[PDB]
Amino acid sequence: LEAARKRPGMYIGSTSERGLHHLVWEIVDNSIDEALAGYANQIEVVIEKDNWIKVTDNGRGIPVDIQEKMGRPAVEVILTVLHAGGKGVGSSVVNALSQDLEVYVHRNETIYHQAYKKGVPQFDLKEVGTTDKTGTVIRFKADGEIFTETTVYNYETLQQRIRELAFLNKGIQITLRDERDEENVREDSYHYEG
Ligand SMILES: C=C1CC[C@@H](O[C@H]2C[C@@](O)([C@H](C)NC(=O)c3[nH]c(C)c(Cl)c3Cl)[C@H](O)[C@@H](C)O2)[C@@H]2C=C[C@H](C)[C@H](C(=O)C3=C(O)[C@H](C(C)C)N([C@@H]4O[C@@H](C)[C@@H](OC(N)=O)[C@@H](OC(C)=O)[C@H]4OC)C3=O)[C@@H]12
């Protein structure tokens, strides 16, 4: 839990620009995972005001249904229990390494939401609207405490990895939007069929 917070290098490599951009990598790899299972074909990575990150896929939505073994909803589990769903480190490390984190699962024509602070859930999963679409949405502001030196994302850095991933995993459409400045909005959509 706090192991990722105490040993960040031992979990994301660097606590500099490399580690900051790596937070965006672990959340996107989660969407690529869902996409290679044949459920999502669209990923969107937005750099929002005050260097927040918003990752959106058109997947089935992280299961919201209670884990009959932990009692907590499945979405709360992957985001809170370290390394959950594997052995690529986990969306939970991106959680513990963020001062603020939000989750919006679109499933059962409804929006399930929950928010975290340094991994810690601020409240229990609540339903906050109805929806036509299915998928997951993650917003995070990397913790100012851990990422000493830089918290501002390099667009060209994100562009390069997104362009590569789109090409490796063909069929997937990954989009990058820079919204940090309302007056000049940047966008690059990557979709290779071959
Ligand atoms: C916690 C969950 C619920 C969610 C599930 O992942 C989803 C993800 C999925 O929604 C899809 C890829 N996600 C997205 O679309 C997505 N989109 C975005 C923007 C994001 Cl973020 C995501 Cl995600 C996919 O569609 C569905 C089918 O699966 C996870 C996948 C596999 C596991 C079976 C996992 C689970 O039930 C686990 C458990 O019961 C235990 C927990 C309760 C402790 N656990 C373990 O958690 C640790 C101790 C481990 O530790 C490691 N490996 O270091 C093991 O533990 C062990 C003992 O090895 C690991 O395996 C047992 C688990 O991983 C599952």
UniProtKB/Swiss-Prot annotation:
Q: Which domain of life is it from?
A: Bacteria
Localization of this protein: Cytoplasm
Further remark:
Few gyrases are as efficient as E.coli at forming negative supercoils. Not all organisms have 2 type II topoisomerases; in organisms with a single type II topoisomerase this enzyme also has to decatenate newly replicated chromosomes.
User: Main role?
Assistant: A type II topoisomerase that negatively supercoils closed circular double-stranded (ds) DNA in an ATP-dependent manner to modulate DNA topology and maintain chromosomes in an underwound state. Negative supercoiling favors strand separation, and DNA replication, transcription, recombination and repair, all of which involve strand separation. Also able to catalyze the interconversion of other topological isomers of dsDNA rings, including catenanes and knotted rings. Type II topoisomerases break and join 2 DNA strands simultaneously in an ATP-dependent manner.
Instruction: Give the similarity note.
Output: Belongs to the type II topoisomerase GyrB family.
Q: How does it assemble?
A: Heterotetramer, composed of two GyrA and two GyrB chains. In the heterotetramer, GyrA contains the active site tyrosine that forms a transient covalent intermediate with DNA, while GyrB binds cofactors and catalyzes ATP hydrolysis.
Q: What is this protein called?
A: DNA gyrase subunit B
Q: Which organism is it from?
A: Staphylococcus aureus
- Gene name linked to the record: gyrB
Q: Which residues of the full protein are shown?
A: 25 to 231 of 644
